[PDB]
Amino acid sequence: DDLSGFKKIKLGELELFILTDGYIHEENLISFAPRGNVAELKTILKDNFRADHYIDMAINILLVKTKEKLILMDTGMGIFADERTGFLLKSLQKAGFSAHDITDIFLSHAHPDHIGGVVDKQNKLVFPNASIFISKIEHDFWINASIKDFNNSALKAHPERLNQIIPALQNILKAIQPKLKFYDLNKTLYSHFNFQLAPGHTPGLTVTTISSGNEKLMYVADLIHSDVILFPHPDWGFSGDTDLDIATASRKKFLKQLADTKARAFTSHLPWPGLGFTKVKAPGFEWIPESFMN
Numbered sequence: 008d009d010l011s012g013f014k015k016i017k018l019g020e021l022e023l024f025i026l027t028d029g030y031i032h033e034e035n036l037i038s039f040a041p042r043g044n045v046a047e048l049k050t051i052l053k054d055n056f057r058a059d060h061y062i063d064m065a066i067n068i069l070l071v072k073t074k075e076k077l078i079l080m081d082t083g084m085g086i087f088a089d090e091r092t093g094f095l096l097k098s099l100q101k102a103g104f105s106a107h108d109i110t111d112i113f114l115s116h117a118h119p120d121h122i123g124g125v126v127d128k129q130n131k132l133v134f135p136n137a138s139i140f141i142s143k144i145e146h147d148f149w150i151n152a153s154i155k156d157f158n159n160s161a162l163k164a165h166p167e168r169l170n171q172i173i174p175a176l177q178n179i180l181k182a183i184q185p186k187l188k189f190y191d192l193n194k195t196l197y198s199h200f201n202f203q204l205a206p207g208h209t210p211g212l213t214v215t216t217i218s219s220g221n222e223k224l225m226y227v228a229d230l231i232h233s234d235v236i237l238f239p240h241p242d243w244g245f246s247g248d249t250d251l252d253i254a255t256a257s258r259k260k261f262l263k264q265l266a267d268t269k270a271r272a273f274t275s276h277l278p279w280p281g282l283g284f285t286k287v288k289a290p291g292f293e294w295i296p297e298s299f300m301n
């Protein structure tokens with residue numbers, strides 16, 4: 008029952024470690040893709056030799072070691088964990104690190120499966136030496152969030168879970184205020200990191216490019232939640248998108264860019280280790296997972 012694990016890669020002179028928090032087992036395929044066709048969805052799963060009665064979403068986290076810094080990109084379910092999640096720290100330890108080694112956390116967005124790990128059940132910081140970065144748009148959205156904000160979300164069907172989650176997120180944002188930093192979209196951070204917004208999934212979802220010399224890796228976080236469904240059908244959307252239309256536009260924008268530039272991406276929820284390339288297959292895309300020897 009040990010779902011912890013890691014994979015070391017190199018990006019130029021940088022050492023990167025892919026970590027897992029575990030996974031999400033989603034059995035509601037009707038709601039998975041709000042603008043999709045569930046019959047067609049299930050057929051796509053079967054055609055790729057996947058189970059057709061659930062989708063498993065990974066929780067892949069990126070650890071970047073630079074000469075001066077140790078950066079964690081997202082933190083998993085943490086205080087929201089169930090039996091299948093909350094394995095980040097075990098994975099970090101397997102990779103050879105501990106929580107106090109982390110100098111900076113970059114939050115792609117404030118959803119529970121990304122921000123849950125920044126605090127423990129005593130509401131103390133899990134990574135006591137770490138600055139925690141978030142986009143100001145993302146931070147301010149959740150501070151001010153209310154039901155009307157989800158008018159173009161499938162989530163509006165579910166007020167029960169919104170009234171549970173939103174206060175919890177606000178409380179986490181309150182707790183991390185002493186370490187809280189906001190991304191600067193105009194500057195390179197720590198020589199290797201550049202940030203841009205990809206709104207829709209949440210209003211301030213942030214996509215991070217890691218660069219070393221001419222080598223680049225783009226962490227697209229929750230831009231897309233299924234390799235075999237939402238690449239060919241980006242307009243089918245995802246249950247957790249705050250605004251389905253805006254999320255679809257961001258999804259098409261960055262997938263198109265990855266394809267056009269033949270650039271490698273790292274993803275939060277695609278199958279392990281979440282690394283791969285994107286091709287245009289009009290009017291959609293295809294994910295080509297990276298191949299490894301171990």
Ligand SMILES: CCCCCC(=O)N[C@@H](CCO)C(=O)O
Pocket residue numbers: 031118119120168169172173229232246247248276
């Ligand atoms: C108040 C927002 C709650 C939605 C959280 C969410 O969609 N989390 C996961 C999906 C978990 O089902 C994700 O976006 O990847």
Ligand SMILES: [Zn+2]
Pocket residue numbers: 116118208229247
């Ligand atoms: Zn999310």
Ligand SMILES: [Zn+2]
Pocket residue numbers: 118120121229275276
């Ligand atoms: Zn997520």
